[PDB]
Amino acid sequence: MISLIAALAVDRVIGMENAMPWNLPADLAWFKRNTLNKPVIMGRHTWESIGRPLPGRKNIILSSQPGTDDRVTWVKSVDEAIAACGDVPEIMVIGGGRVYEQFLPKAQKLYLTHIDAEVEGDTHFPDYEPDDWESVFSEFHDADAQNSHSYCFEILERR
Ligand SMILES: NC(=O)c1ccc[n+]([C@@H]2O[C@H](COP(=O)([O-])OP(=O)(O)OC[C@H]3O[C@@H](n4cnc5c(N)ncnc54)[C@H](OP(=O)(O)O)[C@@H]3O)[C@@H](O)[C@H]2O)c1
Ligand SMILES: Nc1nc(=O)c2nc(CNc3ccc(C(=O)N[C@@H](CCC(=O)O)C(=O)O)cc3)cnc2[nH]1
Ligand SMILES: [Ca+2]
Numbered sequence: 429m430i431s432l433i434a435a436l437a438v439d440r441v442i443g444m445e446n447a448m449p450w451n452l453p454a455d456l457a458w459f460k461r462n463t464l465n466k467p468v469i470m471g472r473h474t475w476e477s478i479g480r481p482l483p484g485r486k487n488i489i490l491s492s493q494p495g496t497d498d499r500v501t502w503v504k505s506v507d508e509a510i511a512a513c514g515d516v517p518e519i520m521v522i523g524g525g526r527v528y529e530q531f532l533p534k535a536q537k538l539y540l541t542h543i544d545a546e547v548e549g550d551t552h553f554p555d556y557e558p559d560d561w562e563s564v565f566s567e568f569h570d571a572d573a574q575n576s577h578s579y580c581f582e583i584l585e586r587r
């Protein structure tokens with residue numbers, strides 16, 4: 429199964445200048461637990477935004493250009509990315525905007541964090557097609573002294 433995971437601020441903003449201008453501890457914990465032990469596919473910008481291999485995951489980077497690092501696996505097309513992961517249960521696609529766009533039609537599951545933050549950003553999640561999906565889990569949290577925004581963790585299944 430192919431799944432996307434993303435955190436969205438209002439208007440589906442996911443990033444801005446090359447970064448994500450918020451610090452939300454609880455959401456990275458959610459990300460880490462839903463991705464560990466699985467292969468993660470990302471685009472080259474997102475690889476540069478993070479800045480090291482994510483531990484305990486097979487890191488697969490999309491780029492049209494030969495790789496710049498042997499600690500990860502470089503691939504040049506979506507089909508090659510899928511093949512590289514191997515016969516695993518679940519493939520996690522971790523962005524960014526251009527990669528999410530391509531993988532959306534294929535994906536069966538979306539792990540979305542809706543963040544109540546206004547944010548001026550230059551990258552969005554694709555607008556997805558409301559009647560495709562069914563929400564099968566959603567849990568809201570108020571801000572706290574560690575997380576400055578309220579947030580909701582939603583998991584959607586393709587109908
Ligand atoms: N909020 C979140 O959950 C979240 C998650 C991930 C990323 N982000 C944010 O998203 C932004 C980055 O997203 P983006 O749209 O800029 O970049 P992206 O999707 O991270 O990276 C795009 C790059 O990936 C490569 N690529 C993508 N599809 C390919 C294909 N089919 N074949 C070959 N190469 C392919 C290309 O690299 P080449 O140019 O090298 O060919 C392209 O330039 C950042 O602001 C980041 O902070 C947010
Ligand atoms: N829900 C969600 N939230 C995000 O922030 C997110 N970010 C990306 C891409 N950006 C990032 C940014 C930082 C780290 C990161 O450093 N995560 C660590 C936590 C700290 C540590 O390394 O121990 C990790 O191990 O996953 C990963 C992906 C992709 N999907 C997401 N999905
Ligand atoms: Ca907005």
Ligand SMILES: [Ca+2]
Nearest residue numbers: 525526529530
């Ligand atoms: Ca377009």
